[model samples]
Target: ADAVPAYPFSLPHALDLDPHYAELRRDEPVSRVRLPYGEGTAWLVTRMSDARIVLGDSRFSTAAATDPATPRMFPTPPEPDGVLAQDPPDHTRLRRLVGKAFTARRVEEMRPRVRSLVDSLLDDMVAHGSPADLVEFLAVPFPVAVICELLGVPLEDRDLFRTFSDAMLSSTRLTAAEIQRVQQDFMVYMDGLVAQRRDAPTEDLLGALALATDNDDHLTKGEIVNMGVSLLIAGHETSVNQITNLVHLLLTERKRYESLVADPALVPAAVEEMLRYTPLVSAGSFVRVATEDVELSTVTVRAGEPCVVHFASANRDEEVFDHADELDFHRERNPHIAFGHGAHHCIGAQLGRLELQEALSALVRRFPTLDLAEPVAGLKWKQGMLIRGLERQIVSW
Candidate 1:
């Protein structure tokens, strides 16, 4: 038999999706593959339909992923009590408390504030003069500040937040020992914040989480700390890369930015399309172990087998999205799995979307002449992080 080709096929550039995803979706919807840092091979689901099955099926368990032996993207396993590691009742309880803070209505209420923040960042970027690095100015700080404010984390400590966050998401940036050390500090820092919230409650995300209760079942001190850790990292980091990715994707194709310039109203749809188009991560994330034999479109995953749902591949499934490879700002029925599917879908998705919408809209409307300052091939992409993003997107208006 041919070797289960090493997964996470390398990308030639930052935003390029490997052609193998398309090939796999057509030829091997469920294929065994190995990751660089995991215990064993995992079943890679490439088709959207099969991805949905793996994601939503109760038989496939994320809780099992906490076990060190599960196939994974990084050497360190997810923390046992982190919200991402739980399933069903635990996931439901934690999400209920945090979900209240991120509902569409709540996020909409945050819009005017988000827009002002966007304006302030852009204002600073413009003041820095032409040919500014968007990644450094707006992309990094915008979401970081927003998440810090919501979580009640003091903005001055955002540098520490990024340091802790960087190590957590590292693929090659840090050694396993270093990652664990940083994790200890990250958890401890969060524990201290949670403790402060308990002593003197306030109304930020962490404060609300402190008092968040459901029928006398409250988040344990550890659970609250872990929740803060996950929220702070995910809340900012994902959007940091995405904001740049969207801008890079839009401007690289001159007409795409021009189209949006012509119709600023399309910014929201463009944001959705960009989310779908960009392969945010270097490869699939969050391994799921099957509890029993689970049937997929092309294969039956045996019990205890681990599976990786490639959301990047699913987002491009031609069966689900017409002209799957093309970025269509006009596409209406976009049900992209970029934020993922089912129970473990990104909890901060609404907040992330709000930030993206504001960032994209404000940038496009304010700087209709914006274009990349450097050649696409010459731009640097970040190494060793789970998310795929440019090291710097130098742009000029």
Candidate 2:
């Protein structure tokens, strides 16, 4: 089989997935592919079973990819101690501290708060009238507000942190100077916040993390700052995109929209479907490389070589999902790789689910006639980056 073209590979081919994914799945489940903003190529894993093994297996390590010197998918790699980049038993220790705060009980406790936030945002949108940019009014603000409260940051400063999050996620399009400025400024701001938290302790997650003395005796002040920054970025960035993508997917598929609206009970399952169907992160971005040679089903990945796992492709793999391509609101047994799998599975998955459930439910109930202001093709997909999302989505009743 011939190699298929995957232009704008950093972003999703949201306007169409069949032509891109079908060609890859048909021709090459594991193939060499180049990213959008660079010349270097990495293996793109498409099949679900392979992605599961790769993401779940401990042999394929994330520690190598976490190094600043390692060849990265993004222009700048995340801070070393951040959960996304860490490997066990260090990853295990950090995750345990963070996980304690974001347990299923704590997440459930935030539902009422999430509902209130969603309703408040929707109210503003309704008052602002139809033909509004839902991305601005609702989707973006919803997660920002929730994360701000969680981290004990002032809601007004959301716009400030949002700018940093945007710059980090959209580095592929940013100028070198601009990226450096954003990174420097963001670190400065976080450092100040950490200092303040240390000076006068509070009950916020940041304060808790700063105060947390792990049994392993591995936690450091710098590590806490890095972890706090990581939490803020992950807490807001991914959830915001997930909300926006859900709105986009629902608007495009009216029946799916109606089904969920009619049967509110299906909202959770629908959320799973949304994660599976419209992944916020594109292919070749989810999982990473190993420190030692690891034998996968198809080939052996040598030590220090980066291996990119495609969760989006895996979610849609026909072998794993009975109707991989179909969007079913009541999909059961959806072990989608959207939140990932195993030890590295997203720590904030429950919080994210709560946010999505409240936000999507509130939006649909408030604006039953909601429809896209611009066609899917007309909307600008944020391009040349690991994260997948739209620049803006105009929606109206």
For each candidate, the alpha-carbon lDDT, in order, equals 0.82, 0.73
lDDT tens string, model 2, 138-185? 877787678776777866666767777667654436787888888888
TM-score, each model?
0.90, 0.84
Best by lDDT: 1
Encode model 1's per-residue lDDT on 320-346: one tens digit a residue.
999989989998799999999988888
Question: How well does candidate 1 score on lDDT at residue 145?
Answer: 76
Best candidate according to TM-score: 1
Off by over 4 Å in 2: 1-12, 18-20, 23-27, 34-41, 66-72, 76-82, 155-159, 166-202, 211-218
Which segments of model 1 are wrong by more than 4 Å?
A: 154-201, 212-217
